[PDB]
Amino acid sequence: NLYQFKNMIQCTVPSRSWADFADYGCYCGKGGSGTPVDDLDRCCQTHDNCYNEAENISGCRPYFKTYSYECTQGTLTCKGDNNACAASVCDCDRLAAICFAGAPYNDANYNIDLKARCN
Numbered sequence: 001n002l003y004q005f006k007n008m009i010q011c012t013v014p015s016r017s018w019a020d021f022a023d024y025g026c027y028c029g030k031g032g033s034g035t036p037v038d039d040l041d042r043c044c045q046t047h048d049n050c051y052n053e054a055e056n057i058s059g060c061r062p063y064f065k066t067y068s069y070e071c072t073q074g075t076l077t078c079k080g081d082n083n084a085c086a087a088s089v090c091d092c093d094r095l096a097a098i099c100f101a102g103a104p105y106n107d108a109n110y111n112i113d114l115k116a117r118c119n
């Protein structure tokens with residue numbers, strides 16, 4: 001779920017408040033269309049796509065699915081006790097968190113005008 005995703009971030013990118021990723025570019029956050037403004041936004045476009053794919057599994061709701069994972073000593077691990085839906089969402093979240101860590105944060109791209117720049 002988002003709570004857990006929030007925690008994955010704070011664990012892979014402790015230097016930042018998860019809030020910095022909650023509304024960035026065209027895909028990080030409520031957004032979900034248009035051209036990604038930079039590599040970090042692309043991290044979120046991939047994440048969104050991943051969620052849409054996951055939504056294909058019956059009863060699978062990626063914002064709300066509570067999965068099993070661990071983050072310690074810099075490593076994120078989606079545990080073996082996850083069903084197809086949990087494993088899939090956890091993997092979406094784990095890959096995005098990792099992408100976030102290695103992506104440059106461009107202050108200019110925070111909270112942009114979606115209706116005007118993400119068509």
Ligand SMILES: [Ca+2]
Nearest residue numbers: 027029031048
């Ligand atoms: Ca999104």
